[PDB]
Amino acid sequence: GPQDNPYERGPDPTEDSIEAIRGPFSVATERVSSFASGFGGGTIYYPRETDEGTFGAVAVAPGFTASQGSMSWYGERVASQGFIVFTIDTNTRLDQPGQRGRQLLAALDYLVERSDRKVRERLDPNRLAVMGHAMGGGGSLEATVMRPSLKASIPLTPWNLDKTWGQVQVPTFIIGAELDTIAPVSTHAKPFYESLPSSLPKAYMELDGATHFAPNIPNTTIAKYVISWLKRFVDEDTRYSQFLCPNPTDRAIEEYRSTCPYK
Ligand SMILES: [Ca+2]
Ligand SMILES: [Zn+2]
Ligand SMILES: [Zn+2]
Ligand SMILES: [Zn+2]
Ligand SMILES: [Zn+2]
Ligand SMILES: [Zn+2]
């Protein structure tokens, strides 16, 4: 309940509520011009109801050649669970993971400093996270090295030629696609996960039968655990621990690794 955690938002969760296309908050959007400094603009999805307090935020990057449209479904699916979600475009579609990491941070700074009052008043600027697909997922990793105060990081089918992440301090949930041929899990997702410190709160979820582009369309397995990870780490909301620990066993999951329990 709220008495034991000022960041709890929404009713106590169930598998129904974390699998739902929409959570308990209605959502509005603020579009941000590509002319914004430091990144290519995007769309901010935010909860409309203010009666429970302010919210943490997650910036969400797409992958190589891709635009915010490839990530749009995350916007309201996650924001409706009580988050500000900023699906960005990058400066160019050809940007690499390091560049994408810088841009994720620029998008977060935009939320804190430059966003429309409707967004700004709903934001707890102390509770920020990153997520991204493919090179954008490599960017999520990069952003956490650049800014260790981030609360959470969710690299989705991540791509990065840098395979070493032993300096990461941010709780990181990597989602792999078993059949990925662009960012194969053998050489991207799994080594990244294994390189993160074993004392870091972390998880690896591999999706059975999934291709590289699985994160770009609604996927209930991705959504429910993205929501749970953000709740646990952005909101410190231990009502969501039940879904993360012990390891999920959903049929769609090829394998799951974790450092449960998350103290
Ligand atoms: Ca720009
Ligand atoms: Zn509570
Ligand atoms: Zn490295
Ligand atoms: Zn499989
Ligand atoms: Zn279940
Ligand atoms: Zn079911």
The CATH number of the domain holding residue 22 is: 3.40.50.1820
* Alpha-carbon gap, residue 207 to 252, rounded angstroms: 6
Contact 178, 255 (CB under 8 A): no
Ligand with an atom nearest the CA of residue 224:
5
Amino acid identity at 9: R
Contact 16, 50 (CB under 8 A): no
Cα distances (angstroms) measured from residue 123 to each of 9, 27, 53, 219, 239: 13, 14, 9, 27, 21
Range of the domain at 236: 1-263
* Alpha-carbon gap, residue 43 to 54, rounded angstroms: 19
Residue where the block lists tokens 């993205």: 226
**Resolution value in angstroms:** 1.1
* Alpha-carbon gap, residue 58 to 49, rounded angstroms: 18
The total domain count for the chain is 1
Residue 216 tokens read as 């770009």
Q: What is the distance between the terminal CA atoms of the chain, rounded to a whole angstrom?
A: 19
The rounded Å distance from CA 85 to ligand 2 centre is 23
* Alpha-carbon gap, residue 243 to 224, rounded angstroms: 9
* Alpha-carbon gap, residue 73 to 77, rounded angstroms: 6
Residue 205 tokens read as 């979820």
Give the single-character DSSP code of 256.
Answer: E
* Alpha-carbon gap, residue 80 to 84, rounded angstroms: 9
* Alpha-carbon gap, residue 186 to 193, rounded angstroms: 11
Q: Considering only CA atoms, which of 97, 120, 153 is closest in space to residue 30?
A: 120
Residue 94 tokens read as 């050809």
Cα distances (angstroms) measured from residue 128 to each of 13, 173, 176: 22, 15, 23
Amino acid identity at 246: P
Residues around ligand 2, an ion, CB closer than 5 A = 1, 4-5
> Which H or E run contains 152?
strand 152-156
Residues in the chain: 263
Identify the bridge partners of residue 42 per DSSP, sorted by sequence position: 32, 88
Provide the phi-psi class of 220: left if phi over 0, else alpha when psi is between -120 and 50, else beta.
Answer: alpha
The rounded Å distance from CA 164 to ligand 3 centre is 4
Question: Three-state DSSP class for 132?
Answer: strand
* Alpha-carbon gap, residue 9 to 2, rounded angstroms: 8
Contact 89, 67 (CB under 8 A): yes
The rounded Å distance from CA 226 to ligand 3 centre is 24
